[PDB]
């Protein structure tokens, strides 16, 4: 047993698949070329809300004077879409420093937005006061285990998808993503790897693999993939440190590059966040993975970004 | 003498001839954007083709149709003049075909893709923003050079490669009811047209055109054609041409309607496509949404609810914005 069951991920799914895009897998050949493998792209920017994190939220909400959480931007948006379905109000802390974009979407998308200072401590606190504040319930971007089992809903389509699936670069930040995923993946097909991707700026995913044991970033991390700042947590620590098969962590300019690579050669809007797991794959020490494992599927995890960004 | 300079069969033959070289590119759609225009839209993404536009598919027919059963005969040097996307299928197709590419474009094109045609390996040469300038020089360049010219959407083998597209949608959109297609020279929209007209004529054609570079509903009001006057300016840099004498006989015949949109309709369907699809279009491309959303659409039959909008290209500035 892990936070979540595989049965849970199913009934997620039936939960959730009503209201969900089965996203498309789209390919592309001068970027099969740079990569030298056979790259799947998983275009969960194609989903309600702009990111996979309406499952999630979906199924949190279904599966309360209020609802309350923190986010950087996409489950603070994916939150108040499922709530104001509802009829529920919604409270939403999110960073000072964060999207300017996905700051006007959730007010947007109606709710009350309460500004935080960027950390997994500060956002998990203005939290809990406006809590105390409004009597809502919290649902939490990656540790809440309803959530966690929203997102695994990937790994099943994906399956399908690309029959002949060789592994899964995620990117990581609270692990609520590839840890969801990885329950699901991993009874099902193990000679699938299922590959984690993080910037070195926030590398508490391969800290706590090298080390053996929950390592969270303790320094909050400066990075231009705004949505993998958080850390991962203890329901989806045992399932990375058991189930993921490596992590890949690149620096600033590797993600940089391939969001524009993305951006030039795809003609998908991604937010840099979700250029973390093609940087990974196109990475010095992901040029040493085996060449048997040639059918890589990448989860383009969202769209949610400012039409107007450093354009760096 | 009935005849077009194409008919079908060189669709089909066109179709052989670059398959294995062009993406089959999908059909998507977007829940939110058929609510807003109230028919059902699929938008057939030809700015995921090789080299950011569907005029690849064109070139590489061209090209192909260039070269001899021998390497005897083979073009020394293709010659063109392009506002930047024909160019860089064009220097692409001789590329994996050993030929060098000279291209011909206006000072005025945008800069991505006059960079794009230099990392593809062509050499350019700058001419006015106007349709007989760019003829000029590219006979200037031809003479020099011993080239032949490969005409943006005059050529027939062109024509012949830009109808693919209709092929393919025909078979991703079953119960389609229309198609909607940016007209600038008319070489996409011609051989869309005569696919369409031959295979199930049930199914409309449809221009779309900048008011601002109204030569294709001008012609088609007056029944000959009519060019611009001045050179157009619009932000849909890809459709300042003006339609010719290959093509402009089928657009006379067989496009049912051209609906003509303002920069402001254009601008709004582009953001539209950028913020909803999460699609990273080129403004020339939001031209068939402009027109669907347009108070001129509105008397198309609501029997006409299954519509395809060619996303025709995605090549464009991303520092570059207002
Ligand atoms: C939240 C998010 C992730 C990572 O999900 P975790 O569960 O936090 O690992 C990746 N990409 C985008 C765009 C996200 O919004
Ligand atoms: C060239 C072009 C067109 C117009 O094609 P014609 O055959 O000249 O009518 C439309 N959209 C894009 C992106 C183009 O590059
Ligand atoms: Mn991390
Ligand atoms: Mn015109």
Redesign the pocket.
């Given at each position: 047993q892990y936070d979540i069951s595989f049965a849970d991920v199913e009934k997620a799914h039936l939960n959730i698949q009503d209201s969900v895009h089965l996203t498309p897998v789209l390919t592309s050949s001068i970027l099969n070329q740079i990569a030298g493998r056979n790259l799947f792209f998983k275009c969960?920017?194609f989903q309600k809300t702009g990111?996979?994190?309406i499952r999630?939220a979906l199924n949190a909400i279904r599966g309360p004077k209020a609802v309350v959480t923190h986010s950087?931007?996409?489950?603070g948006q994916a939150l108040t879409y499922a709530a104001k379905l509802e009829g529920i109000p919604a409270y939403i802390v999110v960073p000072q420093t964060a999207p300017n974009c996905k700051k006007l979407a959730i007010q947007a998308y109606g709710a009350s937005i309460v500004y935080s200072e960027p950390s997994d401590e500060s956002r998990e606190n203005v939290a809990q006061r406006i809590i105390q504040e409004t009597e809502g319930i919290l649902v939490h971007?990656?540790q809440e285990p309803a959530?966690?089992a929203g997102?695994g809903t990937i790994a099943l389509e994906v399956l399908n998808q690309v029959p002949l699936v060789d592994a899964l670069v995620?990117?990581?930040?609270?692990?609520?993503?590839?840890?969801?995923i990885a329950i699901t993946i991993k009874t099902l097909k193990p000679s699938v790897k299922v590959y984690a991707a993080e910037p070195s700026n926030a590398d508490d995913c391969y800290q706590s693999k090298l080390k053996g044991e929950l390592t969270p970033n303790l320094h909050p991390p400066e990075t231009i993939?705004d949505?993998?700042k958080?850390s991962?947590g203890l329901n989806?620590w045992p399932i990375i440190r058991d189930l993921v098969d490596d992590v890949f962590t690149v620096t600033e300019d590797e993600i940089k590059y391939a969001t524009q690579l993305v951006w030039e050669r795809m003609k998908l809007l991604?937010?840099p966040?979700?250029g973390?797991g093609l940087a990974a794959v196109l990475s010095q020490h992901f040029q040493t993975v085996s060449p048997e494992v040639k059918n890589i599927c990448i989860?383009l995890?969202?769209g949610?970004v400012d039409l107007t960004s450093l354009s760096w």
């Open positions: 969960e920017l990111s996979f994190k999630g950087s931007g996409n489950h971007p990656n959530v966690i997102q995620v990117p990581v930040g609270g692990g609520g993503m590839v840890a969801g993939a949505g993998v958080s991962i989806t991604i937010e966040t979700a973390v989860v995890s969202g949610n």
